[PDB]
Amino acid sequence: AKARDKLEENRDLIVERLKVDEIADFMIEKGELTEEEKKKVDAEDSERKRAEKLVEIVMKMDDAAVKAFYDALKAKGYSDLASLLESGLC
Numbered sequence: 001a002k003a004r005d006k007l008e009e010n011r012d013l014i015v016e017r018l019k020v021d022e023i024a025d026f027m028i029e030k031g032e033l034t035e036e037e038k039k040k041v042d043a044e045d046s047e048r049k050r051a052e053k054l055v056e057i058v059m060k061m062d063d064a065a066v067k068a069f070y071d072a073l074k075a076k077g078y079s080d081l082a083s084l085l086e087s088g089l090c
Contacts, residue, residue, distance in 0.1 A: 002088020003066050008059065010084040015051035017081060023072040024054065032061070032068035063090045 007014070020041055027033035037057055044050045058065045066085075073082035 001090050003063065003070065003085045003090050004059070006085040006088065007055065007066060007069075010081075011055060013084065014081055015048050015055065017078070018047075018051035018054065019076075020047070020050045020054050022076045023069065026072035026075060027065070027068045030068040030071065032065045033057070066090070 021038075024033055024038045024041060028035060028038065041050050041053045041057070044053050058069045070082055070085055070089075073079075073085075
């Protein structure tokens with residue numbers, strides 16, 4: 001009930017910057033994204049639209065998904081994107 005809201009608040013800053021496949025591949029290894037969902041994310045045209053579609057999925061899922069998205073950002077060097085979600089951590 002806090003990292004969810006932190007993520008929708010900072011949604012615009014996140015989607016300008018996300019190289020989506022880096023994150024998607026990390027979330028799959030954590031069992032929080034499907035290859036199938038990864039091909040649907042890929043199917044948007046612009047880079048920002050693919051980022052948009054990825055956050056939408058994360059917003060739909062449980063907080064395990066958000067957690068693995070936070071971890072993806074830390075592990076792929078999105079240190080200050082990841083800090084944006086931090087002050088509450090469900």
